């Protein structure tokens, strides 16, 4: 269903693509607090904006700058406010 199809469209992703993506996911997972949906409807719509950034040819760390990790952290701070 979702969480499989979700998965398949970051699969079609560039491969550098592909490995940010797993490392917020893993981020998130490690530090998330809160509601598992949240978390995962969150990470829904960064496939969202990755999908669109990799067609619209920019780069994945254009997208979370270096540091992942930081991106991550907002990404799961305003979870709270967006989902």
Not at 28 to 55: P, T
């Amino acid at each position: 269903g979702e969480y499989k199809m979700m998965m398949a469209r970051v699969a079609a992703l560039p491969e550098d693509y592909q490995f940010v993506f797993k490392k917020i996911q893993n981020y998130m997972w490690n530090f998330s607090a809160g509601n598992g949906m949240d978390m995962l409807h969150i990470q829904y719509e960064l496939i969202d904006l990755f999908e669109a950034g990799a067609a619209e040819g920019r780069q994945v760390l254009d997208i979370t700058g270096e540091d992942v990790a930081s991106f991550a952290d907002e990404l799961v701070a305003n979870a709270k406010t967006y989902v």
